Assembly symmetry: C3
Homo-oligomer: 239 residues x 3
């Protein structure tokens, strides 16, 4: 089913979905590499209780990259320059209880552009849902250490200030990587990240990197001063 | 083994294969998008009794698309502008008993083109075979119900007349889809449908769609008048 | 880590590595299809008796094609025209004793080109290693029988002399293939071999063919007199 179409306005109205959906289809006439500052926000709402936030003002590029990693990729068409499918549950649709609903909104859009939302539902229902979190490394700090235990994917900001980045595995060993080594290891799993409308393919973006965290419990980033570095991590948990 | 090459004539001779093959290789100098009305027919002939008909004048585009859905995709070459591999048995080659042979024929060709057939045989022999059937919706009917129980793949003619298409699953639920959602869910599994000779990739034909039917027992199509819609389905069964 | 960068000279000095690496990253400003005569050689000196030779002056095209067969492919970037990740161990890192080391060398380079080596280490340590071997068929031999039991992948040099090629499986069955049939079967499993910098893809080189050997015990090669045919095979074994 179709949810909304946005054109002219820089902010979307708070969109309510009452039917239990399982995936979101984002369509736009701006290519995946052209996205700059559009943000999305999704949460489940209880009528008498507390809301369950899944994504809170997440960059659209990071949201798209955290869901289309693997065999899939963002595709296109003659009319739509970017079509991306993002799964919101594990293997079924969100099981809505007596009074829950879903609320989606889009922020910081471009006036002269078009955005389309669609919802996908399937006969199965499930309780496991995907949650998005964000982590930051300051612009004035040299060495930082973050915990990524329990997360299964990360999108990091590619910046020329990064020099070293070391994983820590569940068995205690620490391995140090460079940006080039990380990019090659990332493209070893998913070679193609998008297919353009005319026919060419793009292997990955020039400023975002995807890291699959498997049996990894810690990350240490070693850089120089100058800029902030952002990680977007994703997890699966029961609501 | 090479079966035949066809040029000049609009109709092919009835081609007999006595060696047990397991797959066909179809090659031609016209691109996958340029195939217009070529038809293929395959059947196993028994000495005493009734023949086994696998494909009965099936369109060449649908025959190619029904077999190259998944990891594989139709390839290209400096000499051949279209190469496809179509499997006829599940994991081996057809078991020919004392008085059987396979016969293949091609109909409705073009005079100034070329079509080549090749056979592939395997060390294993099997009894399960692939059958291709055809269902159709006339150009005057509005709403149609089609039984697709037991099938594992379908190919639909993409037309602007089609508005809505609904599945019925094994557990009784009914889900409704738009052509755009169907196309997106289709490309989510197999993103690339063919690779051209110059290097560009094509994710899907502009007039055909491939649908993987998993636990689907019925389809309801809702359209407007103007054209005929065709479904080509494929099943696996023991002979 | 950065092992070496070679440019301006036609040979590289013997490079020593004392850390336990698991993979190599070969990057260069020449395309995969433009590699002509570069050769690589890797060997580990054990402190205990008997050294290990994993590659004995193997061609770089064959080395790159033998390790990037499957889900991955050789990629590119804005700076480097070819990047390939080649594994030397099964799933861990080559285990070295107190003072053992790995010596790598490159031969028959081009003066006006650039080549970069990188090493990848990973937390697990393993003893299973990948060995590359060279086999040949002379120019005065109508047919030759090659035993490939225990091998899992081969790369053959394409020339017009070959007429057919026969596989012998564990069952005892023999199947005869043609060069075109072999190419189609190979591209069925692996559709894309490399991605170019501009965006176009290449499904395979025009002079090298890659064959996956599964449950294959023997090979027959038939030809007409006049040419020498080269194979490069890979095996996995415990040392």
């Amino acid at each position: 089913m179709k949810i909304a179409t946005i054109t002219g306005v820089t902010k979307s109205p708070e969109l309510q979905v009452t039917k239990a959906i399982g995936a979101l289809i984002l369509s736009s006439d701006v290519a995946l590499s052209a996205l700059t500052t559009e943000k999305i926000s999704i949460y489940i709402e209880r009528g008498n209780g507390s809301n369950v936030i899944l994504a809170n003002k997440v960059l659209l590029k990071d949201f798209i990259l955290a869901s289309t990693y693997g065999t899939e990729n963002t595709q296109s068409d003659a009319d739509n320059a970017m079509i991306a499918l993002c799964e919101l549950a594990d293997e079924g649709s969100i099981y809505l209880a007596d009074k829950e609903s879903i609320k989606i909104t889009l922020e910081d859009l471009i006036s002269d552009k078009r955005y389309d939302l669609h919802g996908i539902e399937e006969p199965q229902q499930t309780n496991n849902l995907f949650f998005f979190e964000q982590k930051s490394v300051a612009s004035e700090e040299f060495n930082k250490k973050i915990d990524v235990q329990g997360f299964d994917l990360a999108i990091m900001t590619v910046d020329d200030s990064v020099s070293d980045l070391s994983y820590q595995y569940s068995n205690g060993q620490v391995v140090k990587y460079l940006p080039f080594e990380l990019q090659t290891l990332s493209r070893d799993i998913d070679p193609i990240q998008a297919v353009l409308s005319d026919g060419k393919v793009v292997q990955g973006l020039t400023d975002r990197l995807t890291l699959p965290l498997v049996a990894v419990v810690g990350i240490e980033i070693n850089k120089s001063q100058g800029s902030i570095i952002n990680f977007v991590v994703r997890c699966l948990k029961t609501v």
